[PDB]
Amino acid sequence: MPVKLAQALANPLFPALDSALRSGRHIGLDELDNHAFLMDFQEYLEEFYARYNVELIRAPEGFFYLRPRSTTLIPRSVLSELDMMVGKILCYLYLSPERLANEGIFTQQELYDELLTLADEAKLLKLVNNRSTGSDVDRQKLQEKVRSSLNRLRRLGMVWFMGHDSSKFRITESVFRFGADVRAGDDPREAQRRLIRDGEAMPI
């Protein structure tokens, strides 16, 4: 085993970061200790993980994540379409001037609003309840679900909450991943067939 790899496995950071990483946490500039760690020990940390049949990736926007592979030792999971909307949007907010008054902090509401704006309120409902029209109770499940998927996308390291409550939060470069299908200027179908091959995504 190479010196530098071992020296990497020894840093006090490793066990916890490693745990995160294997639970699908994306790692943004927002954790300096960690991100820095990965910056330092990358080339070796890469191998270390490869042994588990998973790639250690640094997205072009600088963040790191584990991208399980065809053969993977560490089980792989996928996000729900709802989470994906929640995310894509999250990336939009990350890229809007809305933020600039907001000083980086958004709300449960701001999200939810921009969401029903840009999405299809109707099908977006058809996820929650398979057939329901204009319902009200069903417009709460859309909110609760949308909270859930925002919570989950926190585990994942997309988004940091603020304070003791769940009401206000903020956004990591990590969300740019929701934009993979489009990042490369391309027919979204092509680029999707591409990401499906490379382990970035799965069809539904």
């Binding site: 792989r76 996000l79 000083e103």
Partner: protein
């Protein structure tokens, strides 16, 4: 006291209702400002720019109940009455008409004027005298010149605040138009108002202590006499006002440095990486189009360690 005033409010049914219309009317009336006839000519130009007689007497009447508008009946006058504006009509009208007062020269002149009024008040506070010596020499220039000029500096700040919020909004829409284009501009608006917000606060702290110190000689002089409770309550309130001012004035700076920092960050992340704004537009297209061909991201997710019980 605190609930009780609220009890004072609903007792007199003080209500100010000024939808876009009544308001535009008040602003016109203010633009010419007189008498009742003129007031009604006005209400003509207003009703027209959008039942004139009755809606005009209606307007006028709920103008005088809400104490927007004082009234004196003058028969010698067209319509048989005349209408001035109450301090309230004035403040409201002022806000939307008055030009910005941002001039460091103005604040300089104001602080000079307070320096004098305060200094004199003090010399004269410690030179002793009858009731007159104090109501005229100490008390007046405190209550009448100094505290009012303080409220004027307080206004200059709370206006400065609204200018900030404007610059924030300008920067917003400028990046929302020209994207990586609008950078130079948003870096001017940002480093210009970090300059203004510097000088206005250098001045306040500069002349800050002198003022306080003299406010004190006076407080000091109050100490020997027991009749002076009014000059005491005032000099205290006055000191407070000056503190509240310099505090908030130091504080608007720290908040604006927050803003500025985080706008450089936006530039570094959101724009420096997507220079033609393309990625974003395409993001949108992909957000409405998503359900035509869905796909989901993949993420490493290990099997949790099962423990017992």
């Amino acid at each position: 006291t605190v609930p009780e005033l609220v009890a004072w409010a609903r007792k007199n049914d003080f209500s100010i209702s000024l939808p876009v219309d009544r308001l535009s009317f008040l602003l016109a009336v203010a633009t010419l400002n007189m008498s009742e006839g003129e007031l009604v000519d006005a209400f003509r130009h207003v009703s027209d720019a959008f039942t004139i007689g009755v809606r005009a007497n209606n307007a006028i009447n709920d103008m005088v109940r809400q104490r927007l508008l004082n009234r004196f009946t003058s028969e010698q006058a067209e319509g048989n009455a005349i209408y001035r504006l109450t301090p309230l009509g004035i403040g409201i009208t002022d806000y939307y008409i008055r030009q910005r007062e941002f001039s460091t020269l103005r604040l300089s002149m104001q602080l000079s004027i307070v320096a004098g009024e305060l200094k004199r008040a003090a010399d004269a506070a410690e030179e002793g005298g009858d009731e007159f010596h104090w109501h005229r020499n100490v008390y007046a220039p405190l209550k009448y010149s100094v505290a009012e000029i303080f409220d004027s500096i307080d206004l200059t700040q709370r206006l400065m605040d609204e200018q900030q919020q404007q610059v924030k909004d300008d920067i917003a829409q400028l990046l929302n138009k020209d994207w990586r284009a609008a950078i130079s501009s948003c870096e001017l608006l940002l480093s210009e108002t970090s300059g203004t917000l510097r000088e206005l606060q250098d001045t306040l702290e500069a002349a800050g202590d002198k003022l306080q110190a003299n406010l004190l000689r006076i407080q000091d002089a109050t100490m020997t006499h027991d009749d002076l409770h009014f000059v005491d309550r005032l000099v205290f309130d006055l000191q407070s006002k000056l503190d509240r001012i310099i505090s908030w004035g130091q504080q608007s700076i720290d908040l604006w440095i927050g803003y500025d920092r985080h706008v450089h960050k936006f530039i570094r992340t959101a724009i420096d990486m997507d220079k033609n704004r393309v990625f974003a537009q395409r993001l949108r297209q992909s957000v409405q189009t998503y359900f035509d061909e869905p796909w989901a991201l993949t993420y490493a997710n290990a099997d949790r360690l099962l423990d017992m019980r």
